[PDB]
């Protein structure tokens, strides 16, 4: 599922993201938009051959299983494939678990290049939310 903007912060606010540890929802849509471009079935190989998932980009190595990452971990404990669902359900739940690890949304490489340190606001600016 492709989500549209206001759509996708809705949804992100529904399963209680708005604020989560702090961060409030237009960091998380500028993440989704940046790692996925909304697009729930988003993958992509990392060259330590681990991969990311979903529209958060959680990634193999540490939080998902998708039985090609050897020495893994699967924190979240769900198969990788969990974070493509239309149901954003899993990965936000994925995610609350990521950015309370300890460094926060800087987790998502994204997020700190192109969302930490703007106007992360106009993300849901004319959103009935
Ligand atoms: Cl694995
Ligand atoms: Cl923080
Ligand atoms: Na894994």
């Not at 606010?13 to 938009?33: E, I, M, P, T």
């Not at 703007?118 to 004319?126: K, L």
Request: proline share 2%.
């Amino acid at each position: 599922k492709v989500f549209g903007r206001c759509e996708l912060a809705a949804a992100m606010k529904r399963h209680g993201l708005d604020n989560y540890r702090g961060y409030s929802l237009g960091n998380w849509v500028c993440a989704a938009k940046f790692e996925s471009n909304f697009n729930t079935q988003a993958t992509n190989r990392n060259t330590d051959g681990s991969t990311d998932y979903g529209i958060l980009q959680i990634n193999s190595r540490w939080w998902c299983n998708d039985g090609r990452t050897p020495g893994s971990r699967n924190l979240c404990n769900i198969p990788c494939s969990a974070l493509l669902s239309s149901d954003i359900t899993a990965s936000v739940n994925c995610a609350k678990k990521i950015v309370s690890d300890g460094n926060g949304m800087n987790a998502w490489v994204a997020w700190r290049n192109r969302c930490k340190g703007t106007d992360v606001q106009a993300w849901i600016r004319g959103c009935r939310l």
